[PDB]
Design an enzyme around this catalytic site. Structure first.
Site, PDB file in Angstrom:
ATOM      1  N   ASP A  66      -1.998   5.583  -5.096  1.00  0.00           N
ATOM      2  CA  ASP A  66      -2.419   4.200  -3.677  1.00  0.00           C
ATOM      3  C   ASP A  66      -2.960   2.907  -3.846  1.00  0.00           C
ATOM      4  OD1 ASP A  66      -2.990   3.553  -1.241  1.00  0.00           O
ATOM      5  OD2 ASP A  66      -4.675   4.831  -0.680  1.00  0.00           O
ATOM      6  N   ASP A 105       0.811  -1.608   0.182  1.00  0.00           N
ATOM      7  CA  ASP A 105      -0.236   0.116  -0.217  1.00  0.00           C
ATOM      8  C   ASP A 105       0.905   1.354   0.133  1.00  0.00           C
ATOM      9  OD1 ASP A 105      -2.750   1.379   0.486  1.00  0.00           O
ATOM     10  OD2 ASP A 105      -1.395   1.964   2.451  1.00  0.00           O
TER      11      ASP A 105
END
Ligand SMILES: Cc1cc(Cl)c(OCCOc2ccc(C3=C(C(=O)N(Cc4cccc(C)c4C)C4CC4)[C@H]4CNC[C@@H](C3)N4)cc2)c(Cl)c1
Ligand SMILES: *[C@@H]1O[C@H](CO)[C@@H](O)[C@H](O)[C@H]1NC(C)=O
Ligand SMILES: *[C@H]1O[C@H](CO)[C@@H](O)[C@H](O)[C@H]1NC(C)=O
EC number: 3.4.23.15
Length: 337
Positions: A222, A38
């Site tokens: 992201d 992430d």
């Protein structure tokens, strides 16, 4: 020892086009976890064995058993993350983490406290943040920083390939890119500032007309986000422009019309990144009686990061993404599937 040409890769599984995870080992002997990698966070989290079976999110996932690792080293510093459905908390520990065959001595959060939703619906067990130290909770050095300090990788960069759900689900390369998963050449956009994988955006075009983000706006890249997301109001505008009508938290079209929706364009570093209808509608059915959802959702990200758009798995599936720490920039190339 390296001769200056070493990389390593991590193979990902694709769950529903919404969660893309790899496996890492923690401790000696290795305890395996499924993790999401992430770019919108910078801490390593896994659930602890000291999590109470009264937490439903812990009951059905792998737990880390510190007593079974000969290489574990106690820390105990409490750690807290505000999440919009509750607080997640746990304590700091240290052990050896194995990622793509690389072994790294790493600090990580052992979670002892977790809301049931949305965490019980995770296929994966934990999270490996690929963001910058500047956003690390308790300011602990992130995993990629530790990896770099070994001086083993060819370059100070990592990249992501995410497939469409079917076949390799995705792949992360540490220290380079894989020319087999992209076509043509990389264009790069500089980061607004160090410490967050966030760039400037200059316009969002439905069809041939710039309907949004003239006067500019921000885009967070992201890898941990399932969708392209925008502010409530921006999304209203985009959707009312698409014929899409609001369900509960979703936006829907009639599954027969879906295939004739217009292109959406993202203008980033003087190149237009276009998603067609096939890239942003979940076409479960091509039928006039059924409702299909879109891979674009509304979300209002708090300061300091937001208000911002977020370019998540929906955008990454189309564009192979390179994250370049050495030059503080992000590159895109058309992915090949
Ligand atoms: C089962 C389980 C799940 C998780 Cl997320 C976990 O880690 C606890 C740490 O908590 C979070 C850590 C990171 C995030 C982020 C994100 C985020 O929302 N994440 C959770 C997520 C994503 C998709 C689908 C589901 C069901 C979930 C739970 C984690 C990245 C996967 C996204 C969106 N917002 C900004 C960043 C950060 N990226 C959210 C929560 C642990 Cl220890 C166990
Ligand atoms: C680096 O290794 C790859 C292995 O695929 C090889 O093809 C390439 O020639 C090498 N490059 C250098 C700099 O020697
Ligand atoms: C881990 O906690 C110790 C106490 O055991 C503390 O002094 C140390 O700063 C922590 N490690 C880091 C680098 O955060």
């Amino acid at each position: 020892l390296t001769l200056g040409n070493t990389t390593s890769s991590v193979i990902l599984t694709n769950y529903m086009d919404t969660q893309y995870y790899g496996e890492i080992g923690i401790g000696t002997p290795p305890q395996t976890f499924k993790v999401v990698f992430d770019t919108g966070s910078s801490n390593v989290w896994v659930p602890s064995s000291k999590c109470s079976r009264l937490y439903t999110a812990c009951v059905y996932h792998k737990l880390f058993d510190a007593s079974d690792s000969s290489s574990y080293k106690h820390n105990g510093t409490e750690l807290t993350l505000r999440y919009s459905t509750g607080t997640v908390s746990g304590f700091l520990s240290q052990d050896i983490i194995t990622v793509g065959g690389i072994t790294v001595t790493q600090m990580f959060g052992e979670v002892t406290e977790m809301p049931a939703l949305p965490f019980m619906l995770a296929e994966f067990d934990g999270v490996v943040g690929m963001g910058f130290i500047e956003q690390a909770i308790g300011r602990v050095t992130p995993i990629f920083d530790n990896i770099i300090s070994q001086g083993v990788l060819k370059e100070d960069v990592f990249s992501f390939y995410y497939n469409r759900d079917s076949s390799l689900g995705g792949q992360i390369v540490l220290g380079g890119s894989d020319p087999q998963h992209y076509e043509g050449n990389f264009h790069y956009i500089n980061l607004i500032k160090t410490g967050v994988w966030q760039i400037q955006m200059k316009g969002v075009s439905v069809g041939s007309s710039t309907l949004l983000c003239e006067d500019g706006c921000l885009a967070l890249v992201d890898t941990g986000a399932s969708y392209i997301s925008g502010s409530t109001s921006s999304i209203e505008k985009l959707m009312e422009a698409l014929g899409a009508k609001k369900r509960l938290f979703d936006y829907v079209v009639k599954c027969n019309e879906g295939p004739t929706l217009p292109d959406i364009s993202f203008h980033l570093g003087g190149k237009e990144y276009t998603l067609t209808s096939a890239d942003y509608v979940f076409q479960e059915s091509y039928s006039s009686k059924k409702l299909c959802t879109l891979a674009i959702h509304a979300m209002d990200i708090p300061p300091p990061t937001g208000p911002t758009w977020a370019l998540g798995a929906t955008f990454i599936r189309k564009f192979y993404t390179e994250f370049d720490r050495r030059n503080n920039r992000i590159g895109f190339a058309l992915a090949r599937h």
